[PDB]
Design a protein around this ligand. Structure first.
Ligand SMILES: N[C@@H](CCC(=O)N[C@@H](CS)C(=O)NCC(=O)O)C(=O)O
Ligand SMILES: N[C@@H](CCC(=O)N[C@@H](CS)C(=O)NCC(=O)O)C(=O)O
Lengths: 217, 217
């Protein structure tokens, strides 16, 4: 019944798909396929982009009855609120807001590099600064099993996505941080998540769109 | 007592400064001045970046007692929650979330253009796509005085910032949208906002950092 539209890629829909699975949500996916170089045909999407009743047509989008939502963050919060998967206390909300935006910045840093034609030259510099960024996430998490504390919330799904994808970009980046590796293991260990990663529906690749220099396939 | 730290520019602190003024908050600002080209000296900030107790040192930051916050959105939400300036119903929260992220995207589109070395070439294309962007916000707003309905909330402060700065970029951009123009008038007419705009503390310029091609001064 619920419809999740996005490109046939991991991208910004990864956290959403994982959350919908964890919450045992009833949904189907409308997958759009972008054409390859040099045209990068987006007609499949453009043909129905303005016919879905979306206020700000974009991908990903979630349709749930009269509720038509865009903006990955808004979609995650929407689903999470339906299952009590958001911060409750003032402190929990603060941590939630900070991380949501921080992770988005980290996500953009990786994306900017991966879409840069000079990807090769700029990569050494990225991996250089990566331990610094990871250290901050490691310090914030501490000995808590999840980012807001004892209870898993939506940011943990955003957290898993950016961290695990940095691990795919560079296999050894999380070595120095046991709690970050334990976090990944713990998330992938969850019943619903483990089952999903084993199913045919799991879509870990390609990481980015066909227009990417890295992660395009 | 409350401390707001940021560059001596409008940038990401505009919405926050306006919100603090509207809420009649008690605060002081720690201003950092970037050096001019070609060095763009950032030591004024870098010399104390890691001495503030911030979990993810960044600008802007807000210090409120034991509460140290980074990420403009998280700062706006923190302040808003203290003064009943957030969406309440599920529908309001959805509009709030969609707008927060959507306005951030619009903010980035303008900044990407303004920091691009090929600003002159890319400008006509931005101005071409501008009416479409503005149209969407106009349609969403409707006849409501504020973005979430009858009550003003934090997203209205984000909205004013991105809408009004596009107006500084192109004075005539809001002409075709009477409701957006009225929104701008309405916001600038609010008691606390009107008074703040007449004060010496008001900082509408420069729009971006000294590194920008447009709005650097
Ligand atoms: N900030 C938005 C970004 C949305 C976005 O850039 N979507 C890309 C794919 S990642 C797209 O192709 N959107 C379709 C369009 O703009 O027509 C979100 O987080 O959802
Ligand atoms: N997503 C962040 C972006 C923060 C950011 O880019 N801050 C720039 C000025 S706009 C800066 O100079 N940060 C200081 C630093 O990174 O050390 C926010 O919205 O607060």
């Amino acid at each position: 019944p619920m419809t999740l539209g996005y490109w046939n890629i991991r991208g910004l829909a990864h956290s959403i798909r994982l959350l919908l699975e964890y919450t045992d949500s009833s949904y189907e996916e409308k997958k759009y396929t972008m054409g390859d170089a040099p045209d990068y045909d987006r007609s499949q999407w453009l043909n129905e982009k303005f016919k879905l009743g979306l206020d700000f047509p974009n991908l990903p989008y979630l349709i749930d009855g009269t509720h038509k939502i865009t903006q990955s963050n808004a979609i995650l919060r929407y689903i999470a609120r339906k299952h009590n998967l958001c911060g409750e206390s003032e402190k929990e909300q603060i941590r939630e807001d900070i991380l949501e935006n921080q992770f988005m910045d980290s996500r953009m840093q990786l994306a900017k590099l991966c879409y840069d034609p000079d990807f090769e030259k700029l990569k050494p510099e990225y991996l250089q600064a990566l331990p610094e960024m990871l250290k901050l996430y490691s310090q914030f998490l501490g000995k808590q099993p999840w980012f807001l504390g004892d209870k898993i919330t939506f940011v943990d799904f955003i957290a898993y996505d950016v961290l695990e994808r940095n691990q795919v970009f560079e296999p050894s980046c999380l070595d120095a941080f046991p709690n970050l590796k334990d976090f990944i293991s713990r998330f992938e260990g969850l019943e619903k998540i483990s089952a999903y990663m084993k199913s045919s529906r799991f879509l870990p690749r390609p990481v980015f769109t066909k227009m990417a220099v890295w992660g395009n396939k």
